[PDB]
Amino acid sequence: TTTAHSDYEIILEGGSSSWGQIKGRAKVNVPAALPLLPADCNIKIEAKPLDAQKGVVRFTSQIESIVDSTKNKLVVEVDIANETKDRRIAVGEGEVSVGDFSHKFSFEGSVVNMYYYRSDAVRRNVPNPVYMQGRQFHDIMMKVPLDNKDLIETWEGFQQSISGGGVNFGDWIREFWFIGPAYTAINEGGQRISPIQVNNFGVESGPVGVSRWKFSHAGSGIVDSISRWAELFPVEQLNKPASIEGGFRSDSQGIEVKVDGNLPGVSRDAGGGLRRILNHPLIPLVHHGMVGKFNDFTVDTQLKVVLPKGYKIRYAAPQFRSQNLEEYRWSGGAYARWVEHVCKGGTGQFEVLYAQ
Amino acid sequence: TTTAHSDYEIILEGGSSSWGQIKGRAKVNVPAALPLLPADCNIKIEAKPLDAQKGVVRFTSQIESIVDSTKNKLVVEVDIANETKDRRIAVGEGEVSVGDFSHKFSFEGSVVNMYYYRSDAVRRNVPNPVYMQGRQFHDIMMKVPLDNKDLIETWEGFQQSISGGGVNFGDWIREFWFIGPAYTAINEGGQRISPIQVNNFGVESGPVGVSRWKFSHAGSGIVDSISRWAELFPVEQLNKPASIEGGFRSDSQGIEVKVDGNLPGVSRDAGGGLRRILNHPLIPLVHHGMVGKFNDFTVDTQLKVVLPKGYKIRYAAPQFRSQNLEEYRWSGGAYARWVEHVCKGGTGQFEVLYAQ
Amino acid sequence: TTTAHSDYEIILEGGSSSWGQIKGRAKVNVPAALPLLPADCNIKIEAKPLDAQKGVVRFTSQIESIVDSTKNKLVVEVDIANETKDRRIAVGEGEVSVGDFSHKFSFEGSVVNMYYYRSDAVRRNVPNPVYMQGRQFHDIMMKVPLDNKDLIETWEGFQQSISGGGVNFGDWIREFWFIGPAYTAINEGGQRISPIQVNNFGVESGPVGVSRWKFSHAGSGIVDSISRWAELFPVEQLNKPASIEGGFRSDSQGIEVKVDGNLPGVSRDAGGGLRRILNHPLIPLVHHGMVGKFNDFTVDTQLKVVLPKGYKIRYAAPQFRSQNLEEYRWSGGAYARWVEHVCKGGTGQFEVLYAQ
């Protein structure tokens, strides 16, 4: 039969901490939807405080994959900091490699989040606001050394598309950028991508391809990068290194995945002396929903939540199945149906409130 | 197991009447997709003839909900009438309230429906036309007394967005307006929303926020508000009050709903001396289809149709299961699969033709 | 219970041939999603070499349907040839008929495919490239004799929409053109349709409606008409007539279909001395995915592959169930789950590599 076997774990820190140790694992005997298989991928993300006075974080990521025998790699190292409550800045470098090909880059970017409104009538009356509409502005400057024949070729293609295309370049680049079903997923999350504005495009003197470009993306409220702008970057809680790792193996007969992290932001002040496990980000559910409906499956799942010592759940919906002091478990019944729901694209709230 | 239990009833008036008494009830042990739960909502709609000579209808609606403990209310009272076969006019007032907040409004609007074509080649050859492409133009003037700090604040935000945004205001307002997955649902129904054109925005003298704005929406044929413009407002059949009521209760473990109404338009002349139960509106099926695929379910359903005395079904597909004179019932087999189909987004025709 | 019963067959030619005899049949006891039923349709397509020196193909198609008792017919005869590796030309004629109505047409068109990039870094490292982004330009000149009242009426409507609409005509025509859920399907495949540009619209002297119009369509890589431009027209392999036939019967209780063809392009050089059955086109899967999720179903399927004499499979994923020399069969297990997957919108690769 078709069965999804999964295990999730949440271990929460108490006091003034929002930190949690999270774990996930799943295996399902269904094909992945990728038109090129097998596909294996590993991701690691680390965030460490560089300067707590200026709120500078050193964010490092490494992604390695094998897709239909092609070996890929992305490495990135970036310094991130808020400048204002709406403007964040990033300065970094990295390298992208595919088989016998590689290219290096350096960049500087500013990202400005703009909520469409501010209302005390909403703030006073909605205890847990979810959908928050807005638009977010990117201004990117990037540099790539044109140190091989392939980089020269692609740079020349962009020179032709930018000069030839005119107003069409910034418009038509969107379907090049959002390759395959990444394009389809834009509308799926109530998201919009503006045309690209080219401020600078040129070759510096070996030769270096230089560019400065801008775009905005917007959301009707599902887009967490906009609705939860401050929360998604919990620099104020980063008093030590945080890290997350994920990995999957897939082919036309199965998918297997494991995630483990230790990071701030797992819990949040819910008000009235209560705390919550953070609201589930909506984009992962909505996007995974585009693949989660291709095969009927039974659910064999368990969630384990371990609160800090002397703390207890005050409200849980779906209700936990069993308890032993600070440890709570969810399996079968209502929780298994919620698991099926969210794997298929559902965004139905699973809420956990705790205190003491 | 996961089971959808539902009951539907249709009681038809005969002679020159298109009226029917409709009833629906359903319960399913699945979470709702709302990222904020529990959520309960009740709706009541009434339409009464004010002036049959001018074809003026008094349309009143009241919606009350509780979402994650927040109490909401919408009350609206409107005078509606056709001016031409394409232009309808509406003059009304209402109130929107959320928790400790409330605001009143008055409005005047004109809505012009424009079918993209008229063809006798289509009219002569298609006995039951469904997809009809068109565009529909709204021209709205609205007034809100700015009688609290919140209204002043929001009005000021709109003053900044309208003057600052310029051409961007009418464009970017769409993702603010179609909150969360309402934005996603636009494309889902083959629907389009034009940018908003601001004709007037200002403060009148307490202070009153005044605005006049325009937009058009279009459809490729699924949009019933366009394809079935005259049919959706059966003023010619409104010789007495019509009314409909609906209510639901939902949380992360279940959904329960009941609908009951007595209204014209339930049956329609099918031609050749036959009558049909009206074609199923496509938008409800297509939109509910965005939530109906999150959990596998078994179907426990029944539809009961009661024709007027001495009338009989001449054709039914899916075929009814049983009959007793003017009463017909559908359950199990083909009908249960059609029920599953339409709950998931399917628009497959279920046709009932009757006469005598 | 709900069961999809299907049988597929592939018989491959060897040596320098890419030709294959393909067969498909399926029956499922579910309603079709069409809001007008019953619906039966037959299609026949033939391609024959007219001139191998100029690479001219005579492509003929005939489509006949009955939808809710309305009898329809489309007949087309066209001369197609590549002019360059990016530009193809078509010159043809046909007739569209619905019930008591009919109209004839003649046309000339050029279609220019434009891949967004060319990269040797991609070519050297990706053994089987799938997503290829691009845009494709249509330039159509068409003529219809206005020999009945209906043609005069529609021509007059277009005269009003073109002169009245101005810039709006080319924009709003898209929802008229992509009737019903054809509009929704555009975004679904990561596809874009540009506004129509009208170069010529007029009446010639009986009266003939004349028009010249242009549009482009683009894809993020799922759009096979763009990604696989040369492959979808295998003129170099057309040394004799190729033909395909398909037919379906559907209503609110069932769907039944059969396809049979004999055509080039069924196999392709995979490199390294290996051959593959061609990559599955993504658009059919993605589009059928919009209807394939409305009813849970069990899978009763078989695929039979017959290689040319002395050839063997070197790799198959999902793995074949059984073998007897050059004959291989897939049924149950992993293949049945892949069948369920692709019927619901999944694009997960099923790969067959063979040699000798």
Ligand code: BCL
């Ligand atoms: C298909 C399954 C669903 C899903 C199903 C569930 C379920 C079921 C539960 C949670 C729970 C939680 N999930 Mg979730 N969740 C998804 C994806 C996300 C993402 C994300 C960035 O993608 C985030 C930030 C979260 C966040 C959270 C917290 C709100 C919460 C506690 C952590 C936990 O138990 O994790 C468990 C870890 C996982 C489910 C692993 C998810 C891995 C995702 C799919 C990303 C894999 C990326 C891969 C390794 C690399 C991709 C590389 C690119 C190809 C380049 N989820 C995916 C899409 N999630 C729990 C909760 O609500 O507690 C109150 C809970 O019970």
Ligand code: BCL
């Ligand atoms: C995802 C939705 C939005 C988006 C939302 C945001 C948000 C929100 C932010 C940025 C930020 C930035 N974005 Mg942006 N961004 C988008 C698309 C782009 C594209 C592109 C070509 O598509 C580019 C070039 C950029 C460029 C940039 C840089 C200017 C800057 C830092 C990026 C970086 O370091 O990434 C390197 C990172 C990776 C390669 C992996 C990231 C994987 C995912 C996204 C991580 C989620 C967190 C995970 C669940 C938990 C991590 C825990 C660890 C313990 C830390 N964005 C899309 C349209 N972007 C950030 C910034 O610093 O601005 C100044 C910022 O705050």
Ligand code: BCL
């Ligand atoms: C934000 C995007 C990342 C990036 C991410 C990747 C990834 C991921 C991949 C490549 C790959 C390729 N990249 Mg790179 N690449 C960047 C910058 C560059 C620059 C440059 C001078 O800035 C050049 C010449 C190249 C060149 C190339 C090709 C040689 C190579 C294969 C074709 C292709 O898919 O191109 C894709 C080209 C781009 C993504 C960006 C090109 C930028 C141009 C030249 C200048 C700016 C144009 C405009 C203002 C902004 C465009 C925004 C992007 C569409 C997101 N990249 C930056 C640092 N690039 C692929 C590869 O290795 O294949 C074997 C691959 O998988």
Ligand code: BCL
């Ligand atoms: C999920 C289930 C499907 C659905 C499944 C079925 C089934 C199954 C049957 C019909 C049947 C009919 N339906 Mg239907 N139908 C839906 C929604 C609609 C809507 C609408 C405005 O939403 C309309 C006008 C109709 C109209 C009709 C008639 C064509 C026909 C006879 C009435 C009847 O039996 O009703 C029964 C009543 C219902 C199914 C209740 C539907 C309630 C919908 C979901 C709206 C609830 C709104 C809620 C109370 C308030 C929302 C407030 C906002 C949040 C602010 N349906 C929903 C989306 N319908 C029958 C038929 O074809 O007869 C020939 C039949 O057998």
Ligand code: BCL
């Ligand atoms: C729904 C698809 C279209 C749409 C289609 C139509 C159609 C069609 C008509 C209007 C009408 C109007 N619309 Mg409009 N309209 C849309 C979006 C809007 C928006 C907005 C901010 O989104 C606004 C402000 C308006 C504004 C207006 C007013 C000018 C006018 C009367 C509205 C009213 O009284 O509602 C108060 C009503 C409610 C709060 C509840 C309505 C719930 C649903 C929509 C009712 C369906 C009927 C139900 C199944 C059966 C009822 C039976 C009873 C016995 C009567 N429309 C969307 C884009 N609109 C009507 C008019 O009079 O024009 C002059 C008209 O005929």
Ligand code: BCL
């Ligand atoms: C057609 C839309 C309805 C309407 C429906 C609702 C609903 C439903 C809700 C609110 C809520 C709010 N409304 Mg109101 N509201 C209208 C008219 C107004 C006017 C005005 C002077 O005309 C003002 C100042 C306000 C102000 C406010 C906020 C104080 C409040 C919380 C923020 C928010 O969501 O705003 C939303 C603001 C709007 C929907 C319209 C603002 C119109 C502006 C000021 C003038 C016209 C601008 C432009 C020409 C047209 C915009 C079209 C709309 C986007 C649909 N509304 C009209 C009568 N409003 C929410 C609330 O109570 O939260 C606690 C809430 O749930």
Ligand code: BCL
């Ligand atoms: C719903 C089912 C899926 C589907 C499921 C499968 C399965 C399962 C298998 C293949 C296989 C193959 N399919 Mg497929 N396939 C679909 C549609 C397509 C289309 C197309 C133009 O629509 C093409 C070109 C192909 C091509 C191919 C080859 C890559 C491969 C070998 C041929 C074969 O076995 O065919 C079998 C024939 C069919 C499945 C019939 C498909 C008929 C489609 C739905 C079109 C019917 C049109 C109708 C008659 C007329 C419409 C008229 C309009 C209304 C005007 N498929 C549909 C959408 N296909 C096999 C493979 O991968 O081998 C390695 C395999 O095992």
Ligand code: BCL
């Ligand atoms: C499908 C995605 C694209 C598209 C992709 C392409 C591609 C790719 C090509 C054309 C070609 C042409 N297109 Mg175009 N075209 C689109 C929409 C249109 C529309 C429209 C009103 O929507 C029009 C008027 C045209 C017009 C034209 C003509 C200029 C020309 C020949 C058409 C013809 O003979 O069809 C008559 C055909 C039919 C009525 C049936 C076709 C059914 C499907 C599409 C066939 C698939 C092949 C099947 C799986 C296997 C066949 C095997 C046989 C043994 C041959 N296109 C959409 C947006 N078009 C071709 C050309 O010659 O250009 C110069 C060409 O190469």
Ligand code: BCL
């Ligand atoms: C590429 C499109 C095909 C075509 C495919 C079909 C199909 C399929 C159907 C009709 C049907 C109709 N067609 Mg025809 N039709 C074409 C050309 C024409 C021309 C013309 C002088 O060129 C005229 C006057 C007509 C007229 C008509 C109507 C009398 C009739 C019913 C209304 C309707 O759906 O119209 C649809 C009208 C069109 C599809 C095209 C009209 C073109 C106009 C007059 C001139 C060009 C305008 C602009 C530059 C380009 C528009 C592109 C299209 C939107 C795809 N067609 C060409 C050859 N037509 C329907 C029917 O028989 O109903 C009983 C039907 O099912």
